[PDB]
């Protein structure tokens, strides 16, 4: 039940710089992000155990992503995960934060911690997962903000979220019902 709201907000100002979000709509997105983290992390830990791996690596996160997300969501999420890990590993001499080294707004360190308490976790695994969650947040925010703007509103409200989820076959499969 972690709060990603500040990171969600930053993502919103990138995809829809001129669009607000209501309190309740933010709590709903936050609920979606928490739910998807749980699904992927649990899936990735099982894959590690079932393959006798000691470490949850980025390979397990990737396979779990494809197990949990429907087709086009998974491709794009894998693209974003792979790019973030490639940037991260090329930034090893950087003085910046882990999220900055990955080019991410979502908090890599917190994702690492949450992956550990719920055995070992490679340094690429939280970068990849943070990037997937950031992508899914951006995807939902892009569609929800399009719905608000088409509705002639400058703030995303829960109805805009519901429309965005329902009118997208993949998000409706992932997060509907």
């Amino acid at each position: 039940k972690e709060t990603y709201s500040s990171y969600i907000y930053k993502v919103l100002k990138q995809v829809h710089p001129d669009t607000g979000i209501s309190n309740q709509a933010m709590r709903i997105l936050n609920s979606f992000v928490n739910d998807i983290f749980e699904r992927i992390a649990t899936e990735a830990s099982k894959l590690a155990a079932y393959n006798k791996k000691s470490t949850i690596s980025s390979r397990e996160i990737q396979t779990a992503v494809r197990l949990i997300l429907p087709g086009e969501l998974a491709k794009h999420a894998v693209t974003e995960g792979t790019k973030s890990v490639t940037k991260y590993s090329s930034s090893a001499q950087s003085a910046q934060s882990r999220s900055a080294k990955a080019g991410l707004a979502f908090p890599v360190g917190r994702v690492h911690r949450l992956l550990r308490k719920g055995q070992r976790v490679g340094a690429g695994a939280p970068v990849y997962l943070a990037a997937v969650l950031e992508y899914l947040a951006a995807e939902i925010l892009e569609l929800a903000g399009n719905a608000a703007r088409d509705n002639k509103k400058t703030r995303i409200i829960p109805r805009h979220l519901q429309l965005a989820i329902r009118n997208d076959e993949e998000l409706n499969k992932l997060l509907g019902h």
Binding site: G20, N23, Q24, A25, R155
Partner: peptide, 12 residues
Amino acid sequence: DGDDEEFVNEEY
């Protein structure tokens, strides 16, 4: 904290 109220980012 109202449902319809605009979210204010409490971090910077």
